[PDB]
Design a protein around this ligand. Structure first.
Ligand SMILES: Nc1nc2c(ncn2[C@@H]2O[C@H](COP(=O)(O)OP(=O)(O)OP(=O)(O)O)[C@@H](O)[C@H]2O)c(=O)[nH]1
Ligand SMILES: Nc1nc2c(ncn2[C@@H]2O[C@H](COP(=O)(O)OP(=O)(O)O)[C@@H](O)[C@H]2O)c(=O)[nH]1
Ligand SMILES: [Mg+2]
Lengths: 432, 431, 48
């Protein structure tokens, strides 16, 4: 287990993916040319998980950039770290998906899919020991959503034994670019339930609420939302890219986090919450960092963790702090909040501490929870879907692509079963 | 000549192996390059090359290369020949099924070929010492696979284990109870004697006795190595008790399945402490009957003894020992089973305990390791079995094992065997 | 026996995923061909 192959699909996927690469390059001391200029051996110890070493001192992201639209790709190349990417790894179409899952999954996407697989095969065959794949995409669009899930299925076919991981961004009416987002999301959730091993549920509803309510940003931009996404992505991948004992690879993370195959949707959390401009800040102790685990205000999925129960939790502390203090504080939270952890999975909270804090902060905490409360996110999508589907509104955009009504009914039913499954384990007891 | 082959499986096994071999070298005066400027018994554990270099009779195995890569870059890189440090590419991902079946099946033949090459250098091979964790996929899965194959290739050859019983303070997987029960069931019929080391007991000794706020594997292993050295000192030096591997079994194992002795070590003293009075034989003997010095957390006062071995090391006189045992009997019940005599088998090995320079342990003139077969050890199995039951009732995480080709029936079989083992400890203590 | 057992048990479930995944390729080709046949026939209509 070594290399992770990263895929970026659609507008959102490429925007969030590009930010992930500039954040992690900065943490690993890599400049936009690919040269390491850091001053810590920890930065290079597990550099091979995300970077290929090219001739000389240069490091190249093992990243494939995908879109059915060319514009986003140009914006990435023009960017700060745009030059770091492998030129041959940009795979783009000319005919977009027009925020239509059917175009991304069946028409335009199907036409481009083989060109993408050719690039993923090149990266995969170069690997000493491929862990698997990491996909960043939105569920509300057409490319990220439809083509992204098509790619997952095509990759799963060729690499059935590798770990399939995603960072899936959930649509919200609060920051919506299309009226059909509930359809695109439901059709994609159906695909993810079946085809991924782990999915980080990144909710735009929660990101907007954090920016507006907590960061006091009257009109949040994608730039503001993406600052929270990149902080979360950096946090959840800490264990994979730095030397550590816990969840050091994609499979060990999945084995510790996924008790039942379909229940692989994670609720990420982050503390402290910061705004792009906020380079202040003077705060955050160990008890303070720990308290934000149950804090709904710090969740990247718009669910209250106190409305459910944690099946499994992974908590990552970053910065210079006492491991003794972390262990005490973490035990206190489990003992005080006993009722929000399932009794039939003993020692289900695993903690890791990394000496390297993320940029701008001296101390941070990242939470990865497998909570039954994630059903609130799926319920929200199902109700938005049904409001439209009941009247067959905008259905012509999908049937016009060759889709049948049954696929819509099936996707919805599968998502409602997922909700019902979370509820089942929420109500389960250690009567054993 | 009576050679012993040491096998170190997975991260725990390899890391404990590093601590053991470092200590053996200090005890026998072997430098990290295998050179020694020199009783002769050390030859049971170290072979000799044409260049006068001393090489451990050991195999280090891991399914991932990281841990062993540290041995082959480290201080003792010249001590071992490259062929005895075996690594795969893909680990068992804390999954017994991956370690035993999927991944293990690829490297098994290579590991046995290396073991065979070491055995070919032996004139009187006694058997094997197997070091592994219960919790990891390699430590659990690969060990049981290897143990089965060793029984086939080395017909009625002694196999002893040093098993790392899992602790939540240092646990890396939620599935450790599953891996622990699966490995215990499969290995039970293949092991002659197994010494469990509870990571919590070791963690607590480091915290309490060595004043280490947050003990690391380095701290834990140094302490573990001292107990392993106490058990193996009479094989590596011209000892009187536990002189051969068959003698461990004879002295401590009354029934094939009840082969899990409890180790208790004393004294464990901090190095960064003010000069203090050396402990007497009475003081160190008293410390053996204190649950705080145990290697496994359990209550012997709630159990019954079936065998007790006291292994003294250093400046110790028989008169001092007998006086100490006599006073203990006057104050303590020390209850034995009906069919066993109330007694001790005592051994004195003249070499005082050696400690790693710059280590956490203080140098002492005399130390003692008590190996007792008590029914109280069943408490450790019960704790593990209960955690297994909690998850298994919901089939939580079971899909990971089934996906690797394991059958759900193997989980039921393993758990029923553990229930029979708990029942055996109960039946043995009856009268 | 109790190992090639795992080996063979491994394969049924991979072959199975490949079926569950050849079935997912089926649909796509059907729904893309159906996405032409219909447009092919709207003009078959339109001309006459
Ligand atoms: N005492 C001690 N315990 C250890 C050490 N390393 C790991 N462990 C324990 O062993 C268990 C984890 O298993 P590992 O040995 O790390 O894993 P592995 O055998 O390499 O197997 P895989 O990584 O899954 O292939 C946990 O209970 C750890 O606390 C060590 O150096 N010393
Ligand atoms: N967080 C975030 N969401 C975005 C971004 N760009 C678009 N979205 C969201 O993604 C969905 C629209 O999909 P998009 O990725 O633009 O379409 P695609 O190009 O066809 O994949 C909606 O839910 C948008 O709110 C971005 O940069 N950040
Ligand atoms: Mg390991």
């Amino acid at each position: 287990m070594r290399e992770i192959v990263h895929i970026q699909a659609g507008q959102c996927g490429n925007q969030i993916g590009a930010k992930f690469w500039e954040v992690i390059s900065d943490e690993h001391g890599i400049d936009p040319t690919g040269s390491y200029h850091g001053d810590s051996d920890l930065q290079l110890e597990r550099i091979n998980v995300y970077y290929n070493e090219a001739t000389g001192n240069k490091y190249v992201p093992r990243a494939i950039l995908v879109d059915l639209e060319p514009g986003t790709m140009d914006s990435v190349r023009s960017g700060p770290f745009g030059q770091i990417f492998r030129p041959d790894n940009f795979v783009f179409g000319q005919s977009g998906a027009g925020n239509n899952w059917a175009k991304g999954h069946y028409t335009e996407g199907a036409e481009l899919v083989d060109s993408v697989l050719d690039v993923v095969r090149k990266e995969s065959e170069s690997c000493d020991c491929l862990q698997g794949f990491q996909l960043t995409h939105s569920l509300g669009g057409g490319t990220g959503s439809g083509m992204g899930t098509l790619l997952i299925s095509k990759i799963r076919e060729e690499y059935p034994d590798r770990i399939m991981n995603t960072f899936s961004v959930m649509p919200s009416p609060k920051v919506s670019d299309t009226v059909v987002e509930p359809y695109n999301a439901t059709l994609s959730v159906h695909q993810l339930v079946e085809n991924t091993d782990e999915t980080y549920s990144i909710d735009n509803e929660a990101l907007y609420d954090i920016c507006f309510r907590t960061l006091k940003l009257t009109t949040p931009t994608y730039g503001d939302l993406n600052h929270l996404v990149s902080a979360t992505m950096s946090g959840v991948t800490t264990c994979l890219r730095f030397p550590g004992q816990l969840n050091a690879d994609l499979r060990k993370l999945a084995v510790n986090m996924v008790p039942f195959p379909r229940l692989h949707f994670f609720m990420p959390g982050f503390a402290p919450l910061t705004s792009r401009g906020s380079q202040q800040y003077r705060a955050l102790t160990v008890p303070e960092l720990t308290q934000q685990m149950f804090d709904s205000k710090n969740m990247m999925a718009a669910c209250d963790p106190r409305h459910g129960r944690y099946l499994t939790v992974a908590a990552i502390f970053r910065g210079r702090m006492s491991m003794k203090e972390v262990d005490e504080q973490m035990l206190n939270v489990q003992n005080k909040n006993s009722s929000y952890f399932v009794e039939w999975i003993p020692n289900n909270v695993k903690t890791a501490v990394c000496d390297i804090p993320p940029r701008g902060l001296k101390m941070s905490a990242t939470f990865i929870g497998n909570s039954t409360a994630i059903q609130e996110l799926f319920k929200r999508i199902s109700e938005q879907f049904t409001a439209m589907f009941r009247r067959k509104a905008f259905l012509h955009w999908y049937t016009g692509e060759g889709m049948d009504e049954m696929e819509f009914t099936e996707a919805e039913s599968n998502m409602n079963d997922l909700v019902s499954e979370y509820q089942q384990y929420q109500d389960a007891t250690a009567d054993e | 000549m009576r050679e012993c082959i040491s096998i170190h499986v997975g991260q725990a096994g390899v890391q404990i192996g590093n601590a053991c071999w470092e200590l053996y070298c200090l005890e026998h005066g072997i430098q990290p390059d295998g050179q020694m400027p020199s009783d002769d018994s050390f030859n049971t554990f170290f072979s000799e090359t044409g260049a006068g270099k001393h090489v451990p009779r050991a195999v280090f195995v891991d399914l991932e290369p990281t841990v062993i890569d540290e041995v082959r870059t480290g201080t003792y890189r010249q001590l071992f020949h490259p062929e005895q440090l075996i690594t795969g590419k893909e680990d068992a991902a804390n999954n017994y099924a991956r370690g035993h079946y999927t991944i293990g099946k690829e490297i098994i033949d290579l590991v046995l070929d290396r073991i065979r090459k070491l055995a070919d250098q032996c004139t009187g091979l006694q058997g094997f010492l197997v070091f592994h964790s219960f919790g990891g996929g390699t430590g659990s899965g690969f060990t049981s696979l290897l143990m089965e194959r060793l029984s086939v290739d080395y017909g009625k050859k002694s196999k002893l284990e040093f098993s790392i019983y899992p602790a939540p303070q240092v646990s890396t997987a939620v599935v450790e109870p599953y891996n622990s029960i699966l490995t215990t069931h499969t290995t039970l019929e293949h092991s002659d004697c197994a010494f469990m080391v509870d990571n919590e007991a070791i963690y607590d000794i480091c915290r309490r006795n060595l004043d280490i706020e947050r003990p690391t594997y380095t701290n834990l292993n140094r302490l573990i190595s001292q107990i392993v050295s106490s058990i193996t000192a009479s094989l590596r030096f011209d000892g009187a008790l536990n002189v051969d591997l068959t003698e461990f079994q004879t002295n401590l194992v009354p029934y094939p399945r009840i082969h899990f002795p409890l180790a208790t070590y004393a004294p464990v003293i901090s190095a960064e402490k003010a000069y203090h009075e050396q402990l007497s034989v009475a003081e160190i003997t008293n410390a053996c009957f204190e649950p705080a010095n145990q290697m496994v957390k359990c209550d012997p006062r709630h159990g019954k003894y079936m065998a007790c071995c006291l292994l003294y090391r250093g400046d110790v006189v028989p008169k001092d020992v007998n006086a100490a045992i006599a006073t203990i009997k006057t104050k303590r019940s020390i209850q034995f089973v009906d069919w066993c005599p109330t007694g001790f088998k005592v051994g004195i090995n003249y070499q005082p305990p050696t400690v790693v320079p710059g280590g956490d342990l203080a140098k002492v003139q005399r130390a003692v390791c008590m190996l007792s077969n008590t029914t109280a050890i069943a408490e450790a199995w019960a704790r593990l079995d209960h955690k297994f039951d909690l998850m298994y009732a919901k089939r939580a995480f079971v899909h990971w094992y089934v996906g690797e080709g394991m059958e759900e029936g193997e989980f039921s079989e393993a758990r029923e065997d553990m229930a029979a083992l708990e029942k055996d400890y109960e039946e043995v203590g009856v009268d | 026996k109790k190992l090639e057992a795992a080996e063979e048990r491994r394969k049924y479930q991979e072959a199975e995923l490949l079926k569950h995944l050849a079935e997912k390729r089926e649909h796509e080709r059907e729904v893309i061909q159906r996405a032409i046949e219909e447009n092919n026939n709207w003009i078959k209509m339109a001309k006459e």
